[PDB]
């Protein structure tokens with residue numbers, strides 16, 4: 129496994145020259161730029177397209193992933209489910225997007241999720257289907273079943289982010305992703321959050337995961353480190 | 366856990382000034398200098414004492430560990446068991462030694478091992494009781510039982526080094542050391558060898574282990590990295 133390094137950013141509507149300078153300073157470390165958008169209250173596809181245009185010089189160095197992380201999965205986004213899913217579907221129309229995050233949880237409308245995913249894939253977008261538990265790390269068998277349900281949508285990536293309470297929870301997440309990687313077709317990404325889980329981010333490739341997320345400024349999630357230091361780590365394993 | 370970094374050396378009877386200079390150049394990275402001696406055919410306590418003087422160990426720089434690794438546990442040492450154990454016991458008489466490795470395996474004479482360990486401890490030596498499997502990684506429960514048997518001798522450290530052939534084997538070693546660390550009094554050290562196991566060496570402290578072994582020149586065991594890079598890694602977790 130060669131792990132791709134994802135740099136998470138979270139600008140308001142007007143992306144600042146100072147952010148552009150920070151990205152450029154880390155350019156060799158960035159395989160994917162993750163534009164978070166849930167922090168933009170009442171964000172529209174038009175506004176997203178405007179932001180993407182400003183990040184079109186370094187297009188040649190990285191893929192662009194757009195993520196709207198809902199409040200209930202630990203982000204800022206307060207859209208109702210229908211507005212959220214309408215946003216995700218509309219992102220297909222932006223040419224400069226390469227990857228799109230869509231959230232999985234137990235209450236989703238399956239056939240609708242599959243219609244959206246098919247739609248994004250028809251538009252040549254890579255789909256990351258994601259699930260987050262900021263409270264705890266379910267037991268091994270449960271983490272595996274979550275991976276199982278997410279992969280039935282035939283995404284390009286399945287991503288599971290969980291919060292460890294102890295060392296065993298960290299090892300369970302690593303085991304879940306390792307067993308998935310050895311047995312299943314699509315790419316997997318596991319994150320054990322917080323300082324305790326940092327090893328999941330640095331040794332992600334050892335256990336067969338495809339992406340690791342870091343930051344440019346402050347951590348955008350518990351345990352994130354700067355992408356320059358993250359790239360150096362990934363290269364060691 | 367603050368992990369101590371061990372630098373493994375394996376010189377001939379006459380230690381060359383060039384080695385001493387390499388050690389001194391890495392003094393900030395070295396908490397323990399491990400003088401391997403099994404590579405000296407028919408080595409005596411007198412010859413070990415001569416080599417120790419030749420190191421000219423400076424006050425307050427690193428602890429000195431002396432290790433005779435037997436051929437059957439993956440070293441070079443061809444001593445019969447009685448000669449081996451007589452060597453281990455005689456090491457107590459060398460003032461400059463701080464720590465001594467003694468090997469555990471299923472067929473040991475327990476009461477004799479305990480007599481020797483008590484003896485070393487009466488001489489103010491820290492005892493590292495160690496076990497190595499260069500072939501494979503036993504299952505979790507077996508790794509735990511090995512740790513259990515080794516700790517009954519009330520050593521200062523229990524050390525288990527095993528060879529992974531897949532991701533689950535690496536995770537099993539990490540789980541065994543973590544559970545030991547959480548439940549038992551004495552210090553624990555775990556090594557999953559080879560490149561696949563490198564994470565056990567760099568994230569040792571995450572899982573509660575007390576030592577991590579690296580090299581000066583060439584790797585002295587599969588997966589070792591240079592102690593300067595090892596110290597930097599330990600500091601990240």
Ligand SMILES: *C[C@@]1(O)C[C@@H](C(=O)O)C[C@@H](O)[C@@H]1O
Nearest residue numbers: 136195289319341348349352
């Ligand atoms: C995928 C994701 O939730 C992982 C977070 C992390 O823990 O690094 C960062 C988020 O920006 C990201 O969408």
Ligand SMILES: *C[C@@]1(O)C[C@@H](C(=O)O)C[C@@H](O)[C@@H]1O
Nearest residue numbers: 373432526556578585586589
């Ligand atoms: C403890 C020990 O057997 C571990 C080896 C390793 O895998 O780094 C190095 C040996 O010198 C050492 O005694």
Ligand SMILES: [Li+]
Nearest residue numbers: 330361567598
């Ligand atoms: Li690392």
